[PDB]
């Protein structure tokens, strides 16, 4: 999972 | 045992 | 006319109550695991009279079967117990992390992961000795210092709550001190489950597939932040969120020690943090989908 | 009118929402709970020798797994010692009390040893040819070994042996000792006539006799003793003295049950005829100064 | 005169954050009940109930679309 600039 |  | 839909709208009493019921079973069930949790589960591991430097060493001196084992990877070190796996290919792995029923908490502190924690192995029916491998994850630094023992190599497994199972091999695998905050550095990749450690998620793309990288990340656990996230806010840390120790970057492609959801089907709105701190593997089922088995193993490579 | 209702599910979302806050209150205590793993009946005590007399004679009082490192050893290995009032040091090499473990093993397998250890002592094992040649040969001081039997009766018997030492690999682990030393076992070493040609108590020794398993022959037989009787001892074509043969529950067997035709199971012919499998079996040494 | 509305409207969309957050705590529990296994004698056979909790959110974001 990531985490959007 | 012995084997003859 | 007016107050068309009133008492209609009263089906709040019946959420309500049913939930206040809800809770009083929940209680319930803490109390009873609480005194369950008087008396500590018990294993009895007679050690194997042989033994070695790691698990690859012992197969090659008769070490047959998968057990646990006790190997001294160094003079200096004292001799740990450890689970060898000497069946999956050619044996002589060396399990550092394992994943079967959620029996262990993986979401612990610094020292714990450093430490290593949980069960090495369990025993098997009537044997005398810890045939089965139990949850745990073998501690930093005796990982850190067998992949720099030598040329190491790594390999991933997991399996669905389907019966089906994915691989990921890396011919490399490095783990620093922890001075070096367990610099993961891998390699070498090949396999069914996805490349999550070395490319990201395949499902995302930009710099979103990029932040999910692992290799090259560092270590980190809820009380110890070093994930490549970079805020100053103290509750966006990627370990606190998407559930215990690992190399985090922004954060994840794979999480092997996440939370153990039951059926693997998972939700956010299920989530402690409503991210999806299971036991994923993205770049295989996706990121709501926590796995029945989850394994890391090591062993030299060759050279 | 109607507001009276809307109280209740206030006077029960406010308290089963604060219940809500004691629950994660007894949540978070059973975490604390259950962070802990198993524990482990098995421990290893903290007392090093060079063999289990040492260990005692530094102190230690009870039976159970130690760590020695014997003189020209270069790491230290896992053993089990057996410790009596007295304060004698038994280092047990082999062990046998239930069929549990494989004694068909290769030349590798018995040289570093099979099995497992435990505190108890209830457990069947075979240390290391090497562990066993490094030991007894550690230093000038002599060793003597002491064979102790059990039948299906709860009899027991021993024989004990002096000088004994074991050879190194680049001598096939050969089986020496000076000479018997007694013991209501009989002497199996020595041989035994059983009938036939004039040499059946010759070739049924076994001082001086060098080790064999299926995969390494140095048996005096022109056939592979090992191989058939499947296991691994010192061989003479074959034997009077086989405590590493195959187990043979109730301790009576036949030429029947035997793949071969041949006694395969674990005999003391000087004590029990070669069709009887002893039930428990032991071999320790100890320091010879320790008997007198 | 309204009294009950903006309150009823209000108390509901709050009883609605109950579910989601209860939900959140069975799952949570029943997980941490679980980690108990492999430390503990033995862990308490269990059986999480979350379809129900699902049929009761639809059930009130129905509801939840009145006024
Ligand atoms: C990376 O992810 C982010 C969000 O997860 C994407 O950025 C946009 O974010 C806004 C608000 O969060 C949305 O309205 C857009 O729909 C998002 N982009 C789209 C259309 O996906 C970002 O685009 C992602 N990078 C890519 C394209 O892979
Ligand atoms: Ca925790
Ligand atoms: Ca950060
Ligand atoms: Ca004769
Ligand atoms: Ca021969």
Same mark, same amino acid.
């Given at each position: 999972?990531?985490?959007?600039? | 045992?012995?084997?003859? | 006319?007016?107050?068309?839909? $009133?008492?209609?709208?009263?089906?709040?009493?019946?959420?309500?109550?049913?939930?206040?019921?809800?809770?009083?079973?929940?209680?319930?069930?803490?109390?009873?695991?609480?005194? %369950?949790?008087?008396?500590?589960?018990?294993?009895?591991?007679?050690?194997?009279?042989?033994?070695?430097?790691?698990?690859?060493?012992?197969?090659?001196?008769?070490?047959?079967?998968?057990?646990?084992?006790?190997?001294?990877?160094?003079?200096?070190?004292?001799? %740990?117990? /450890?689970?060898?796996?000497?069946?999956?290919?050619?044996?002589?792995?060396?399990?550092?992390?394992?994943?079967?029923?959620?029996?262990?908490?993986?979401?612990?502190?610094?020292?714990?992961?450093?430490?290593?924690?949980?069960? /090495?192995?369990?025993?098997?029916?009537?044997?005398?000795?810890?045939?089965?491998?139990?949850? %745990?994850?073998?501690?930093?630094?005796?990982?850190?210092? @067998?992949?720099?023992?030598?040329?190491?190599?790594?390999?991933?497994?997991?399996?669905?709550?389907?019966?089906?199972?994915?691989?990921?091999? %890396?011919?490399?695998?490095? /783990?620093?001190?922890?001075?070096?905050?367990?610099?993961?550095? /891998?390699?070498?990749?090949?396999?069914?489950?996805?490349?999550?450690?070395?490319?990201?998620?395949?499902?995302?793309?930009?710099?979103?597939?990029?932040?999910?990288?692992?290799?090259?990340?560092?270590?980190?656990?809820?009380?110890?932040?070093?994930?490549?996230? @970079?805020?100053?806010?103290?509750?966006?840390?990627?370990?606190?969120?998407?559930?215990?120790?690992?190399?985090?970057?922004?954060?994840?492609?794979?999480?092997?020690?996440?939370?153990?959801?039951?059926?693997?089907?998972?939700?956010?709105?299920?989530?402690?943090?409503?991210?999806?701190?299971?036991?994923?593997?993205?770049?295989?089922?996706?990121?709501?989908?926590?796995?029945?088995?989850?394994?890391?193993?090591?062993? $030299?490579?060759?050279? | 009118?109607?507001?009276?209702?809307?109280?209740?599910?206030?006077?029960?979302?406010?308290?089963?929402?604060?219940?809500?806050?004691?629950?994660?209150?007894?949540?978070?205590?059973?975490?604390?709970?259950?962070?802990? &793993?198993?524990?482990?009946?098995?421990?290893?005590?903290?007392?090093?020798?060079?063999?289990?007399?040492?260990?005692?004679?530094?102190?230690?009082?009870?039976?159970?797994?130690?760590?020695?490192?014997?003189?020209?050893?270069?790491?230290?290995?896992?053993?089990?010692?057996?410790?009596?009032?007295?304060?004698?040091?038994?280092?047990?090499?082999?062990?046998?009390?239930?069929?549990?473990?494989?004694?068909?093993?290769?030349?590798?397998?018995?040289?570093?040893?099979?099995?497992?250890?435990?505190?108890?002592?209830?457990?069947?094992?075979?240390?290391?040819?090497?562990?066993?040649?490094?030991?007894?040969?550690?230093?000038?001081? &002599?060793?003597?070994?002491?064979?102790?039997?059990?039948?299906?009766?709860?009899?027991?018997?021993?024989?004990?042996?002096?000088?004994?030492?074991?050879?190194?690999?680049?001598?096939?682990?050969?089986?020496?000792?000076?000479?018997?030393?007694?013991?209501?076992?009989?002497?199996?070493?020595?041989?035994?006539?059983?009938?036939?040609? &004039?040499?059946?108590?010759?070739?049924?020794?076994?001082? !001086?006799?060098?080790?064999?398993?299926?995969?390494?022959?140095?048996?005096?037989?022109? !056939?592979?003793?090992?191989?058939?009787?499947?296991?691994?001892?010192?061989?003479?074509?074959?034997?009077? !003295?086989?405590?590493?043969?195959?187990?043979?529950?109730?301790?009576?067997?036949?030429?029947?049950?035997?793949?071969?035709?041949?006694?395969?199971?674990?005999?003391?012919?000087?004590?029990?005829?070669?069709?009887?499998?002893?039930?428990?079996?032991?071999?320790?040494?100890?320091?010879?100064?320790?008997?007198? | 005169?309204?009294?009950? #509305?903006?309150?009823?409207?209000?108390?509901?969309?709050?009883?609605?954050?109950?579910? *989601?957050?209860?939900?959140?705590?069975? #799952?949570?529990?029943?997980?941490?009940?679980?980690?108990?296994?492999?430390?503990?004698?033995?862990?308490?056979?269990?059986?999480?109930?979350?379809?129900?909790?699902?049929?009761?959110?639809?059930?009130?974001?129905? *509801?939840?679309?009145?006024?």
């Amino acid at each position: 999972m990531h985490r959007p600039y | 045992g012995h084997r003859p | 006319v007016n107050s068309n839909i $009133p008492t209609n709208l009263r089906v709040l009493r019946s959420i309500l109550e049913n939930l206040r019921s809800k809770i009083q079973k929940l209680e319930s069930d803490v109390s009873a695991q609480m005194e %369950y949790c008087r008396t500590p589960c018990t294993v009895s591991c007679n050690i194997p009279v042989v033994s070695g430097k790691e698990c690859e060493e012992i197969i090659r001196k008769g070490g047959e079967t998968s057990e646990m084992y006790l190997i001294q990877p160094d003079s200096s070190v004292k001799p %740990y117990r /450890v689970y060898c796996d000497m069946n999956t290919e050619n044996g002589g792995w060396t399990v550092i992390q394992n994943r079967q029923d959620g029996s262990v908490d993986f979401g612990r502190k610094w020292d714990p992961y450093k430490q290593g924690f949980g069960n /090495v192995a369990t025993n098997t029916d009537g044997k005398n000795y810890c045939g089965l491998p139990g949850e %745990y994850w073998l501690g930093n630094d005796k990982i850190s210092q @067998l992949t720099r023992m030598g040329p190491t190599e790594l390999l991933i497994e997991m399996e669905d709550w389907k019966g089906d199972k994915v691989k990921a091999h %890396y011919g490399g695998f490095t /783990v620093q001190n922890e001075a070096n905050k367990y610099q993961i550095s /891998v390699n070498k990749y090949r396999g069914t489950a996805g490349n999550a450690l070395m490319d990201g998620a395949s499902q995302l793309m930009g710099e979103n597939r990029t932040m999910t990288i692992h290799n090259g990340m560092f270590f980190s656990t809820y009380d110890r932040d070093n994930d490549g996230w @970079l805020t100053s806010d103290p509750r966006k840390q990627c370990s606190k969120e998407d559930g215990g120790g690992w190399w985090y970057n922004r954060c994840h492609a794979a999480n092997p020690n996440g939370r153990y959801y039951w059926g693997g089907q998972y939700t956010w709105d299920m989530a402690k943090h409503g991210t999806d701190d299971g036991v994923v593997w993205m770049n295989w089922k996706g990121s709501w989908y926590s796995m029945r088995k989850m394994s890391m193993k090591i062993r $030299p490579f060759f050279p | 009118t109607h507001d009276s209702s809307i109280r209740y599910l206030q006077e029960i979302y406010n308290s089963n929402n604060q219940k809500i806050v004691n629950l994660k209150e007894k949540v978070a205590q059973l975490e604390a709970q259950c962070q802990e &793993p198993c524990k482990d009946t098995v421990q290893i005590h903290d007392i090093t020798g060079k063999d289990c007399q040492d260990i005692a004679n530094k102190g230690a009082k009870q039976s159970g797994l130690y760590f020695i490192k014997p003189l020209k050893a270069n790491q230290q290995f896992l053993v089990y010692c057996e410790i009596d009032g007295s304060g004698n040091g038994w280092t047990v090499f082999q062990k046998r009390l239930d069929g549990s473990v494989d004694f068909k093993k290769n030349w590798i397998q018995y040289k570093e040893g099979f099995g497992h250890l435990s505190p108890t002592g209830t457990t069947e094992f075979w240390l290391g040819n090497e562990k066993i040649h490094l030991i007894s040969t550690q230093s000038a001081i &002599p060793y003597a070994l002491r064979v102790e039997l059990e039948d299906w009766n709860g009899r027991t018997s021993t024989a004990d042996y002096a000088m004994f030492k074991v050879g190194p690999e680049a001598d096939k682990y050969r089986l020496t000792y000076a000479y018997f030393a007694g013991g209501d076992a009989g002497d199996a070493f020595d041989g035994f006539d059983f009938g036939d040609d &004039p040499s059946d108590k010759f070739f049924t020794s076994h001082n !001086g006799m060098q080790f064999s398993t299926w995969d390494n022959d140095n048996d005096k037989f022109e !056939g592979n003793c090992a191989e058939q009787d499947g296991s691994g001892w010192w061989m003479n074509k074959c034997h009077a !003295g086989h405590l590493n043969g195959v187990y043979y529950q109730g301790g009576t067997y036949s030429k029947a049950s035997t793949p071969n035709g041949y006694d395969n199971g674990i005999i003391w012919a000087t004590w029990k005829t070669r069709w009887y499998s002893m039930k428990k079996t032991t071999m320790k040494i100890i320091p010879f100064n320790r008997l007198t | 005169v309204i009294e009950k #509305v903006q309150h009823i409207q209000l108390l509901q969309k709050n009883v609605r954050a109950q579910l *989601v957050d209860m939900k959140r705590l069975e #799952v949570d529990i029943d997980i941490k009940i679980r980690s108990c296994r492999g430390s503990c004698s033995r862990a308490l056979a269990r059986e999480v109930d979350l379809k129900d909790y699902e049929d009761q959110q639809k059930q009130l974001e129905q *509801v939840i679309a009145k006024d």
